[model samples]
Target: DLNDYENVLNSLDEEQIGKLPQNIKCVVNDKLNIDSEINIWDATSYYVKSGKVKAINFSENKDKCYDLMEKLAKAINLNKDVCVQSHRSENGNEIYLWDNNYTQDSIAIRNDSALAETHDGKLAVSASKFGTYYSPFNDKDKFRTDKQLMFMSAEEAEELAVKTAKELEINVCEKNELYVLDDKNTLIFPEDDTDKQNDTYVFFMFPDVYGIPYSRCPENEALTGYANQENHLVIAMDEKGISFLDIPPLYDWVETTETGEILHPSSILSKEVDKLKKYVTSGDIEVSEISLEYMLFADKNETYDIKPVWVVYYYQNQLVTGENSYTQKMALYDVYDAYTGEEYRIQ
Candidate 1:
């Protein structure tokens, strides 16, 4: 059930996600909203000196979504003039827009929402009072999809993936054991920075099997950023026809240091709450939760180093006109080194 939930979150196509509001009938459609949002950060977001999202952002009354657009256009390193729009994301926080550009709309929200066409009508974001961080609305949709993905069928793609897995000599519990997601209808969209020939199909392979974290795959683990479905000129090797990412824990590493057991994620969360409140000079911010994960970041020379940190996901609210209506301004996150207790700003 957990793996199902994981896969659901992992490989969701845009259309399947657009139906979320109607399906869950969030007003009473519990059975309907049965699933979740797609995590677009391929984790390779680190190599992007191309400037991923920034923190402690400002809400400019000025039309600097245009001024800032110049800075972003170059940092994002794209040639054409990307469409950028700035508006309060209904939550009232300033947001900039980019068409079909998820990786570089400038500010990325790690939330359970997808980008859809605004013309899709009023999307029911919350039952309490409809919201749209169920968003990336009409704007981002210009890039997501209109008809259907032209990739191979899910069944065929699954077979090819398995063949690549075996050919790469990947370790897995079993072929049936790997989380195979080939959503037949939705096309596979890798990160915008992905280097592909535009004609080949890419399949992602991971070892998040049976709820086991990538750090500990039950047995031999096979991992690939993208497995080419076209020819035999493999990218995974020197070894086989696949791409290999040198991720730790997956490549045989220590469970933990002889120092001691890693600090539990919840321990310093209270401190983190205080950290955010002080970090932002505005409202009386309250911390709701702190999520801990072992993350990888690239050093100056472009090599990735992994470390444990806690991402604090909290919200600040500004009161609305009605008795209980509060504009949920921004759902923000702050990263802290889990071990040292320092704010690890995403670089």
Candidate 2:
């Protein structure tokens, strides 16, 4: 059910309000026109999901970082006598945990090459089998069937991940936030050979402050830029154990300088129609979902500004070919300010 935008704008002209419905439909089908059948994933609860957003800053916790490493070493069943070492880099202080044979320079197959960062949180800790030293060319033939390759199913891996996060005192978001790495981390062959088996599961978690989930920092964007770092956590596992683990930075929220209500979904679409038209040309674009999320902007010194935004997930008629059939490609997203109805760009 679509509600009127009267509460959003009290003194709106009746004519302008009347045109909103037509403008929104046009925005979905004609103007922006990204999908054959567009769907707003959170349309029913969009209004209730939008409310006060926060601007915040974070402080570093070196002790907690070390503690996390220790807990992880045990969670993944690392050898009790493994030695821990730290090295300094531009990104942050890099920590490595290793056994007797697998040092930094001489990493052997099946050996754990655990690593963590002290600066922008922890980078990643993984074993050579599925981490830094994994190579499909060399390791593919090791396991012939999916049953032989996969030690744990998707559900098992998720349970282990949640258990590890809980031991680390990390708050994992809901199921909607859980992204099962199917294709990207999975190795699938034709029906003649083994089936698909997931090698890892990435969990993108956010701070539990606002009623709705805040925006998640893009995995690549935040990892590359030290200044724009928000929150990021990823757990990769395989038949052996926890193959890859990325720990998000622990932050102490400073203060909320500004608070604003998110604009209605229809208003956001109607306002950004012109700007969105520039991005779409002739293809039958499919908009998968539109939801409220946060984008963090770096400020002077060590301060940061976390602002709310709307992300429009759309596709440009891309398809992936299989041996028998084809499937739709992953959707790309465009960001807009949630409160102001303006485009938000990633820098």
Candidate 3:
């Protein structure tokens, strides 16, 4: 019934056409092999064909770079839809680009006589410096124009001030004290004074804490109250992390004995305290606790009885020594609910 069917029959003799049906029956029984050379070649060709397709697509849509530039300009608050002008450095190491000029609509709005002097000047100058004005603001310095300089917003100024402060390197005070103006404009020592006189307050500004002044030795008598006795006081977290008393039993123990009396053999606690004190209070040595921030506990679900677990503080002083024996300094501390299990070791 089909026109092609008669043409297929005409191509073969009666005997051959009878064999054709048998041949097709045998082909239907055989397994179809998908792993043929032809099929593999077709798949590989299809994947490679995409590269040419992409090249053709890009050739037709070549303005992508221009579109991206326009988007960037709009994001930075620059005028869009303006003709772009480009320039290159003499050495060709750098290239510069900018908008051509102000549009007719922009020019018309800028020329209005009713505008304020500053606003009018800003717009007129902006138009005149087209393709050259790198900044959107008007140039008042060059023209000495009565236009007021544009002031930075409060947020912007504050950001710059903070950045400047972080970069500034202040001199370390010899007396270990620093004075700063408070929000109320009152001059206060934000740090503690470590000297025996307690005249100045030493401040660790980075940690944002002030040290409290304490007298190490009384002025009236060198030997009085020299007997070693425990003096411990614990305070809450200061601006610095943990602060504690550092009095060791060296000075008092030595002074308590009568003059020229043979004292019993005991470990020299004063020398150890003096060494630690000189290492900390004196800036000559870089002590671990000199300037540091407290670490916050990680578990938020756990309730803390106190805001901070421990308060640690340190102080040091210098003492002269005998031949080949160095003078010893002492460090003292007063700890609250002291944990004796964990021995303190200097790092």
Candidate 4:
């Protein structure tokens, strides 16, 4: 009976109507009516119960579908003028398409060329496999997957560097160091000093949050300008690590001495000393001793032959120690020896 019902619908002929009884025939006729009110009601009810349906009729020939897909691909490939734009959330996880403003038009044109070049280079390097490889410049064999290298962000790169350094048992210093190098890997910063002041070169520690080295001089000796200078150096904790800042200019020597009078070092000293005093008085900076060292600059040719001068003072309970008891060191620039390389609290 079900087979007969299906065959009758497929035939699209009135001959099937004659096979049914009068009541069944009338019901079928009413259901299939083009003008009857019941037909519209039935159609609406069907849609309401089953939801709307979109029927797509594909051609019987398989080649038709393949041809359509090929056409779509060709359209995308040929439209090099089109652009792709993206937006990323604050957390850098969710990404959304924001606009299509032709930003990537040139990149689209060069896509195939870049891919071919990359493939050729990979073959030349013998990196057919997807894994780690050692760069001649670094001792460690770091992860070198093409997919990882192309997609990782700066933060991801830093984290990967840290992980690789740990795995290789590398002892990266906690404090950053400056290493000057030419294209030929020639050292430039210390510049072969005859006085052996290179060992006393002040190694600056970069602040993790601010991404700058701590240095006293704000202008001439600072790393604020002139990136291409011959003395420029990359400052970092290790060779493979990201450079946190540039190296400060290396000086001939740092003179140290004692000025028997208590005086702030520079114009900026008042603000810095006031801030430090507040911190100490507020119990923010807890320390057994607060010593301030002052540097006195003189012309390289001016030789007094006498012991150079500096100012040293202690701070406690918002007051500086002694009226004028700054003591004498061998030289003004030799404070590094007097303090034994420890940071002296200035508050």
Task: Provide the RMSD of all predictions against the true structure, rounded to 1 decimal.
Answer: 18.7, 10.5, 40.5, 39.1
Cα lDDT, model 2, residue 16: 30
Residue 313's lDDT in candidate 4: 21
The number of clashing residue pairs in model 2 is 5
Specify the highest-lDDT model's number. 2
Writing each residue's lDDT as its tens digit, candidate 2 over 3-114 gives 2333222221123322322122223545345222222223223332222222321112346445555676665555436554433333543333443233222111111122
Candidate 4 Cα deviation (angstroms), residue 205: 2.9
In angstroms, what RMSD does candidate 1 have relative to the true structure?
18.7
Using TM-score, give the best candidate's number. 2
Off by over 4 Å in 4: 1-215, 220-245, 252-298, 302-347
Residues 221-269, candidate 4: write the lDDT tens digits: 2222222111212212222223122222222222333322222122112
The backbone clash count of each candidate, in order, is 11, 5, 28, 12
Score every model by TM-score.
0.29, 0.57, 0.15, 0.17
lDDT (Cα, tens digit) per residue for candidate 1, span 1-347: 33242333332222331222111101111111122122211222211111111121223334433444333333223233544444446555555444424433232211111121111111111111211121111111122222222454445544655564454343432212111111321223333343222212233344322211122111111221122111111111111111221111232222332221233333344355345445453433434333334443333332333454445544444455564654544444556655566764422
Stretch of 10 with least lDDT, candidate 2: 104-113
Q: How many clashing residue pairs are found in candidate 1? A: 11
Regions of model 2 farther than 4 Å from truth: 1-62, 89-156, 176-208, 211-214, 217-232, 272-274, 282-284, 317-331, 345-347
